[PDB]
RNA sequence: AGUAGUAACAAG
């Protein structure tokens, strides 16, 4: 008898038991070495997809940029970055016509946000890139460093605390002939440095076999990217076909709503087909100048300063410089030696050291390589513009109404800037095929390519969108991974509260099951008791705290009034996950116990601040 | 780097908690079973002394008691 | 907010063709009206840009093509099916404080040692250096008994054989590029693809033995609050009926063993960075009568732990007891050196038998992230329940009725779970739960990028097959590309090969 | 040590029947020391045979 | 040797 769990799919539908297809219990793959090869491969692919563009040498920097706009129309199904600005503007105009007044309201809200934006919003974020150190630093540290640098070379108009003032300081810093670093710097090198994108390899990434390159921008463009993202979020919030930034339950509601809307008019003589797919090479296919044109159309009849602020970001993103990472490592077996060659030395190096593929990539990247930074004018890098691309896709999605197609077929659906579900209605199979072909050609006209391998078409009723599986009205949210459910490592009460809050948040958001939540609570309680040696007073486990806990247990009368940190029973459950432990058991504590527990004169204190909220040593 | 492993390692030690010197007066140095509660050695950085969780449990089961009824009042969101 | 000269030039360099200045482009955008541009562009494009819909019939899908080559070998961190334990009965008192003395007691409980000899030699390694290690492990134990002060942890002396088996002084010296510019053989590291391997039959037996029940309890859980809401009652019923059936599965023993081994190894690496610390494999369980039981599996000798990144490799030497003759399946033990260390006396229903007891000694390596994720193997349990109730809850949605009591109380085999020459094997809910737990445990143990890629690639094929079975007329745009992507991840990992074989079997049996 | 650990009912010692010809506190200070010297075993880096 | 897989660890 050979056990085959996949045979369970013979009876149970795969949508009901899809959790067996997510091996999210092992360690995700990591990257050993440098990301220079991946970065060079990405740049070569991006420039190959635009090989029929216009090459123009820069003036301020001198790097040769590539312009694929208004290039030759594609002749095959291969990816192409040739996007016509007229088609994009027409799609934006049609989207505005279908939903009047969205752009003006979004602009007003974004202007209000800009006028009401502080400078500390840049402190919170991911690991950013520091140009002064040319390294990867936390956002707060990089912000402090650039503030000190702008204080050295006198530019101190951002001390008021407004982000607009910092943006103006960055604006004025680009015209300085000389720059000083706490290493004297001139103007051209500073301008090149300000456009540098630090490249590394993404770790802990699932669903892929080979590693991929991820880029991080500098500290100068953070505010402009923030403003652009705010505008895109404001636009998306008024669109019902977007997938961001709603939650899991809201996403399920959106799926049900769109399915019901499409199926509320389908008669017996009308056929409906649903396709699910992804977008291949999405990041390296969208020209930043297309985003610039879209933003320009967005800000029609607006103050000049606001539209200039919006347009600053695509201008810099159209002339970005990509770093080459760390470098490479060479080995000599006979001499038994290993050496490290930095990325800056790749400009002048013999090709006999590398293999065929590496030397081919180096040869292809050398003409675009200057001072250790390559030119990457076309295409986004990893994820900087998500919701703007979602707006671009939803424009094409909205372009599928009957008033525009003017044919017996018509399509709608949802998109999340990489995943898309498209449902098309037509009276016959030929109409379905014609609508699918029209949608594919329209997407190709803008720079959107549908991955044929990852896309499939069936009859309406079962489909998938962003790991949400819809089947006959039932949706399962399996787009996240369960956390470790362990101690945080601060103190007793803080760790208990944080664990309970994490369990509650996972239950309310990630659609965690009740039995699974109870099991997670049990595991967390076990880990907490083992870590803090706070076992129950009626147990037979010998620790250093065993004697004191036993004395406390035999001293008290109401056993349920003791906290878990003091050997008390675990009264937490599903219905009590929103109540702190101290307040939950407050009515069961003894008078002396509660008097001593929260005494304000305890030496440990200089959630409720009790004696368990001590401070460890560094 | 990893707070969980650091917390486990620190709790595996003898005197992980820091406290004011005043704790030298409210609680005895030795338990009735002979276990130590705090150490005379001084930490680096200030005059604070070292204290084991046994001292916390001892204070919980043996310590000054006062009429504390304001806690449910001032703390309302948690209560 | 004005634009300066440098930024003005930068903007002028960031415009579409046939646009001299940014003001001209802005004016053009401000006065634009859509006039049939999209239709004209569509007519201009050739007919080669098309997306045909290829029907997916009952004969279109083909079985996956497994790679060929030498048979795959075992690559787990410790023995799973052939592991042998030396057990002692720990009473209620004397709680577990030191594992070294427990290992010493477990070793003392055995009296059938003999002179070790090599049975299955290692091909690419120096065999005697392994043997000289094992005897040393014995000797360093006896030096404990005559020591004037009993130590907590034992650090092995860096002998000649331990220096070779732990990879000491093996990395090349780090020198600057300037001093080695002119070297005739100075090249970069060889970034070659993994060698292809062919699927073997031992992994199926391993999985089959992983789902069986044991005679001991391996997991103990704490208590929670009383049940008040009906949802709490249903959750408690589901959790209890899952735990009471899954507590005695061997996968729980594997989880506990891996968690303990990884935790001990990580602690030793953090503490003793420059010591050859000896770490024994120890597990704890509860007997049916209700008494503690401590089992010893073997020993681990850990090298240096000077780790800077999260991908640095610590080398260790693992010796594990076993009762399986390595000569039955030599290809499974390619990276193992096996000795013969004793003669166990087994008392069974047939009486007294004598079985030789071997010792599998091998050199392995691990990283910090692997050790960290090995300490969280218990989450597999948390996943397994999630794979059950979410299924059962699904059966509620189609019926608008809680089917919790309608599935656990069904005293009949209801789910197809196995394969037999007679036909598809049927099983109850408990067998399904054990199988899911074993699958999660094996995913945790054999985690690799190949498996993650293959599962994601084959999910779409599974969905297509399900849609075909639902008479929804599925269609594909490029089936060959999807098949090539699926087959790209099958290189040398036995777990992924077994999963691919399972998928092929399911595809064969789903159209009959 | 194990036999001592099996008990959990210790308390602060006090003199009940004093010795007539001897210094009573010197006895009491002895007993507490016997406890303390036991605890110093548990934190010792190397467990000794005799104390 | 071994870990590992498109490049690295096997101390600096
Ligand atoms: Mg998809």
What six digits make up the tokens of C448?
């690799």
Number of H helices, E strands in chain C: 16, 15
Residues A129, A214: Cα–Cα separation, whole Å: 12
* DSSP string covering A57-97: E-SSS--EEEE-TT-PPP-SSS------HHHHHHHHHHHHH
* β-pair partners for A330: A339, C188
* DSSP string covering chain D: -HHHHT---------SS--SSS-HHHHHHHHHHHHHHHHHHHT-SEEES--
Beta-sheet strands, E only, within C375-414: none
CA atoms within 13 A of residue C104's CA, in its CB half-sphere: 17
Q: Do D8 and A551 touch (CB under 8 A)?
A: yes
Q: Give the three-state DSSP class for A179.
A: strand
Which residue in C292, C286, C295, C296 sits closest to C93, CA to CA? C292
| Domain regions of chain C by residue span | 56-76+447-512, 77-175+249-374, 200-248+375-446
Per-residue flag: A37 CB under 7 A of strand E: yes
Kindly state whether D49 is in contact with chain C, defined as any CB-CB distance less than 8 angstroms.
yes
C369 CA, E11 C1': Å apart: 19
Tokens 């006979």 locate to A334
CB atoms within 10 A of CB C152: 13
As a residue count, chain D comes to 51
Residues B66, C349: Cα–Cα separation, whole Å: 69
Sign, CA torsion A283/A284/A287/A290: negative
Strand E: which of residues 259-298 in chain C lie with Cβ below 7 A? 274
The pair phi, psi for residue B68, each rounded to 5°, is -110, 95
Per-residue flag: C125 CB under 7 A of strand E: yes
Categorise residue A101: left if φ over 0, alpha if ψ from -120 to 50, beta otherwise. Answer: left
In Å, how far are C88, C260, C382 from C283, measured between CA atoms? 11, 7, 21
Q: What is the 3-state secondary structure (H, E, C) of C184-204?
A: CCEEECCCCCCCCCECCCHHH
Tokens 């013999």 locate to A350
Residues A522, C24: Cα–Cα separation, whole Å: 67
What determination technique applies here?
cryo-EM
- The answer to whether A418 is a known ligand-binding residue is yes
What six digits make up the tokens of A333?
């077996």
Strand E: which of residues 134-163 in chain C lie with Cβ below 7 A? none
Q: Using an 8 Å Cβ cutoff, are A515 and C227 in contact?
A: no
Residues A450, C478: Cα–Cα separation, whole Å: 11
In Å, how far are A397, A595, A598, A608, C376 from B59, measured between CA atoms? 67, 11, 11, 17, 35
Strand E: which of residues 553-592 in chain A lie with Cβ below 7 A? none
Nucleotides of E under 7 A from a protein CB: 1-12
What six digits make up the tokens of A212?
């991929």
Subunits touching D (CB < 8 Å, at least 3 pairs)? A, B, C
- Strand pairing of C173-174 and A337-342? parallel
> What is the helix (H) or strand (E) element at residue B8, kind and residue range?
helix B3-11
In Å, how far are A262, C53, C309, C312, C457 from A30, measured between CA atoms? 43, 38, 11, 11, 20
Per-residue flag: A125 CB under 7 A of strand E: no
Tokens 């069986």 locate to C212
What six digits make up the tokens of C8?
């003005």
Residues C87, C94: Cα–Cα separation, whole Å: 16
Tokens 């500073």 locate to A190
What six digits make up the tokens of C461?
């094929």
Shortest Cα distance, chain D CAs vs residue C146, angstroms: 11
Which residue in A61, A290, C256, C270 sits closest to B2, CA to CA? C270
- Strand pairing of A327-332 and A337-342? antiparallel
The pair phi, psi for residue C133, each rounded to 5°, is -65, -50
Residues C482, C487: Cα–Cα separation, whole Å: 9
Q: Using an 8 Å Cβ cutoff, are A318 and C9 in contact?
A: no
Residues C170, A42: Cα–Cα separation, whole Å: 35
Q: What is the 3-state secondary structure (H, E, C) of C406-424?
A: HHHCCCCCCEEEEECCCCE
- Strand pairing of A213-216 and A196-201? antiparallel
What six digits make up the tokens of B57?
């449990």
Q: Strand order of the sheet with strand C475-476?
A: A410-415, A419-426, A271-278, A456-459, C475-476, C54-55
Sign, CA torsion C23/C29/C32/C35: positive
Q: With beta carbons under 8 A apart, name residues in chain A contacting C55.
A: none
Q: Using an 8 Å Cβ cutoff, are A483 and A498 in contact?
A: no
* DSSP string covering C288-350: SSS-EEEEEEEEEEE------SSS-EEEEEEEEEE-S-TTSSGGGGTT-EEEEEEEEEEEETT
Sign, CA torsion C296/C298/C303/C305: negative
Q: With beta carbons under 8 A apart, name residues in chain D contacting A550.
A: 8
Chain B residues within 8 angstroms (CB to CB) of chain C? 2, 5, 9
Q: Using an 8 Å Cβ cutoff, are A394 and A413 in contact?
A: no
Residues A297, A316: Cα–Cα separation, whole Å: 19
Residues C62, C44: Cα–Cα separation, whole Å: 39
Shortest Cα distance, chain A CAs vs residue D7, angstroms: 9
Beta-sheet strands, E only, within C24-164: 54-55, 86-88, 113-120, 149-151, 155-156
Q: In chain D, which among 1-51 make CB contacts under 8 A with chain A?
A: 5, 8, 10, 42
- The answer to whether A279 is a known ligand-binding residue is yes
Strand E: which of residues 204-243 in chain C lie with Cβ below 7 A? none
What six digits make up the tokens of C232?
């709490």
Chain A residues within 8 angstroms (CB to CB) of chain B? 486-490, 495, 531-533, 544-545, 547-549, 551-552, 555, 566, 580, 582-583, 586, 591-604, 606-608, 611-612, 614-617
Residues A586, A561: Cα–Cα separation, whole Å: 7
Q: What is the resolution of this structure in A?
A: 3.1
Residues 6+ apart with CB under 8 A from A250: none
Per-residue flag: A32 CB under 7 A of strand E: yes
* DSSP string covering A46-60: HHHTTTTSEEEE-SS
Per-residue flag: C304 CB under 7 A of strand E: yes
Rg over alpha carbons for chain B, rounded to the nearest Å, is 16
What six digits make up the tokens of A353?
């050291």
Measured at the CA of C80, the angle between CA C76 and CA C83, to 5 degrees, comes to 120
Interhelix angle for A356-365 vs A36-48, to 10°? Answer: 60
Nearest CA in chain D to A555: D9
Residues D3, D26: Cα–Cα separation, whole Å: 26
Q: What is the DSSP letter of C248?
A: T
């Amino acid at each position: 008898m050979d056990v085959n769990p996949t045979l369970l799919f013979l009876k149970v539908p795969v949508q009901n038991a899809i959790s067996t297809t997510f091996p999210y219990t092992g360690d995700p793959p990591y990257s050993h070495g440098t990301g220079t090869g991946y970065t060079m491969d990405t740049v070569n692919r991006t420039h190959k997809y635009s090989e029929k563009g216009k090459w123009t040498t820069n003036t301020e920097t001198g790097a040769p940029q590539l312009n694929p706009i208004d290039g030759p129309l594609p002749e095959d199904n291969e990816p192409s970055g040739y996007a016509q600005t007229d088609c994009v503007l027409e799609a934006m105009a049609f989207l505005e016509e279908s939903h009047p007044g969205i752009f003006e309201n979004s602009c007003l809200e974004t202007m209000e946000i800009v006028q009401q934006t502080r400078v500390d919003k840049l402190t919170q974020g991911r690991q950013t890139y520091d140009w002064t150190l040319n390294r990867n630093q936390p956002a707060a540290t990089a912000l402090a460093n650039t503030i000190e640098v702008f204080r050295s070379n006198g530019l101190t108009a951002n001390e008021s605390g407004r982000l607009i003032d910092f943006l103006k300081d960055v604006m004025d810093s680009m015209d300085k002939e000389e720059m000083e670093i706490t290493q004297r710097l001139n103007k051209r090198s500073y301008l090149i440095r300000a456009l540098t994108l630090n490249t590394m390899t993404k770790d802990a990434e699932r669903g892929k076999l080979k590693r991929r390159a991820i880029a991080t921008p500098g500290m100068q463009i953070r505010g402009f990217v923030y403003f652009v993202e705010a505008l895109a979020r404001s636009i998306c919030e008024k669109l019902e076909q977007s997938g961001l930034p709603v939650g899991g339950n809201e996403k399920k509601a959106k799926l049900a709503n769109v399915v019901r809307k499409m199926m509320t008019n389908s008669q017996d003589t009308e056929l409906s087909f649903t396709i699910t797919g992804d977008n291949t090479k999405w990041n390296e296919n969208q020209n930043p100048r297309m985003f610039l044109a879209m933003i320009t159309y967005i800000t029609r009849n607006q103050p000049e300063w606001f539209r200039n602020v919006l347009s600053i970001a695509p201008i810099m993103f159209s002339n970005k410089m990509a770093r080459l990472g760390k470098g490479y490592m060479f080995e000599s077996k006979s001499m038994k030696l290993r050496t490290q060659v930095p990325a800056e030395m790749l400009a002048n190096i013999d090709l006999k050291y590398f293999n065929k593929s590496t030397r081919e990539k180096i040869e292809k990247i050398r003409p675009l390589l200057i001072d250790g930074t390559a030119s990457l004018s076309p295409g986004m890098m990893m994820g900087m513009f998500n919701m703007l691309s979602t707006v671009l896709g939803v424009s094409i999605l909205n372009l599928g109404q009957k008033k525009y197609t003017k044919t017996t077929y018509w399509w709608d659906g949802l998109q999340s800037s990489d995943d898309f579900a498209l449902i098309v209605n037509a009276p016959n199979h030929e109409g379905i095929q014609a609508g699918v072909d029209r949608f594919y050609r329209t997407c190709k006209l803008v720079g959107i390519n549908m991955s044929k391998k990852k896309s499939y078409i069936n009859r309406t009723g079962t489909f998938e969108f962003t790991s949400f599986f819809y089947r006959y009205g039932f949706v399962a949210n399996f787009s996240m991974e369960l956390p470790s459910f362990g101690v945080s490592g601060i103190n007793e009460s803080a760790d208990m509260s944080v664990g309970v809050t994490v369990i509650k948040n996972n239950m309310i958001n990630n659609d965690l099951g009740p039995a699974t939540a109870q099991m997670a609570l049990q595991l967390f309680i076990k880990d907490y008791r083992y870590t803090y040696r706070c076992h129950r007073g009626d147990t037979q486990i010998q620790t250093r705290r065993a004697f004191e806990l036993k004395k406390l247990w035999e001293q008290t009368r109401s056993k349920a009034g003791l906290l878990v940190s003091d050997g008390g029973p675990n009264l937490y459950n599903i219905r009590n996950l929103h109540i702190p432990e101290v307040c939950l058991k407050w009515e069961l504590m003894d008078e002396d116990y509660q008097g001593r527990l929260c005494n304000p004169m305890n030496p440990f204190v200089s959630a409720v601040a009790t004696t368990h909220s001590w401070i460890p040593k560094r | 780097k990893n707070p969980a492993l650091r917390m486990k390692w620190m709790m595996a030690m003898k005197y992980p908690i820091t406290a004011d010197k005043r704790i030298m007066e409210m609680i005895p140095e030795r338990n009735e079973q002979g276990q130590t509660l705090w150490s005379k050695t001084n930490d680096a950085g200030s005059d604070r002394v070292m204290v084991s969780p046994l001292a916390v449990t001892w204070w919980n089961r043996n310590g000054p008691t006062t009429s504390t009824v304001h806690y449910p009042k001032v703390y309302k969101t948690y209560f | 907010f004005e634009i300066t000269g440098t930024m003005r030039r930068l903007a002028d360099q960031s415009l579409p063709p046939n646009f001299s200045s940014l003001e001209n482009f802005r004016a053009y955008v401000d006065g634009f009206e859509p006039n049939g541009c999209i239709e004209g562009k569509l007519s201009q494009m050739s007919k080669e840009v098309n997306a045909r819909i290829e029907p997916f019939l009952r004969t279109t899908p083909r079985p996956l093509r497994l790679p060929d080559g030498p048979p795959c070998s075992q690559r787990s961190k410790f023995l799973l099916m052939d592991a042998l334990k030396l057990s002692i009965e720990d009473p209620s008192h004397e709680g577990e404080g030191i594992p070294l003395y427990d290992a010493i007691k477990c070793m003392k409980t055995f009296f059938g040692w003999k002179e070790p000899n090599i049975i299955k030699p290692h091909e690419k390694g120096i065999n005697p250096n392994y043997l000289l290690t094992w005897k040393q492990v014995l000797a360093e134990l006896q030096d404990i008994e005559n020591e004037e002060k009993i130590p907590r942890t034992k650090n092995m002396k860096k002998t000649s054989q331990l220096k070779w088996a732990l990879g000491e002084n093996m990395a090349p010296e780090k020198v600057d590029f300037e001093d080695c510019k002119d070297v005739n053989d100075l090249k970069q590291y060889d970034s070659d693809e993994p060698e292809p391997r062919s699927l073997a039959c031992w992994i199926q037996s391993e999985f089959n033995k992983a789902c069986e029940l044991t005679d001991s309890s391996w997991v103990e859980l704490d208590e929670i609050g009383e049940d008040v809401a009906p949802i709490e009652h249903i959750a408690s019923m589901r959790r209890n009926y899952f735990t009471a059936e899954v507590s005695h599965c061997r996968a729980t023993e594997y989880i506990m063993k891996g968690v303990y081994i990884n935790t001990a190894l990580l602690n030793a690496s953090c503490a003793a960075m420059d010591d050859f610390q000896l770490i024994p494999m120890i597990s704890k369980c509860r007997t049916k009568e209700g008494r503690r039981k401590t089992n010893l599996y073997g020993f681990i000798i850990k090298g240096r732990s000077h780790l800077r990144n999260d991908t640095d490799v610590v080398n260790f030497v693992s010796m594990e007891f076993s009762l399986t003759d390595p000569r039955l399946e030599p290809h499974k033990w390619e990276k193992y050196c096996v000795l013969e260390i004793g003669d166990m006396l087994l008392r069974t229903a047939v009486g007294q038998v004598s079985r030789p007891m071997f010792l599998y000694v091998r050199t392995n390596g691990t990283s910090k992230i692997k050790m960290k994720w090995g300490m969280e193997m218990r989450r597999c349990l948390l996943q397994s329940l999630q794979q059950i109730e979410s299924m059962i809850e699904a059966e509620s949605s189609v019926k608008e009725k809680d089917l919790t009591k309608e599935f656990f109380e069904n005293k009949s085999e209801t789910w197809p779970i196995g394969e037999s020459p007679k036909g598809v094997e049927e099983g109850s809910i408990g067998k399904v739960c054990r199988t899911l737990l074993a699958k999660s445990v094996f995913n945790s143990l054999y985690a690799s990028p190949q498996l993650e890629g293959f599962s994601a690639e084959s999910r779409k094929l599974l969905l297509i097959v399900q849609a075909l079975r639902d008479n929804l007329e599925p269609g594909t745009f490029d089936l060959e590309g999807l098949y090539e992507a699926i087959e790209e991840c099958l290189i040398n990992d036995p777990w992924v090969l077994l999963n691919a074989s399972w998928f092929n079997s399911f595809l064969t049996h789903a159209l009959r």
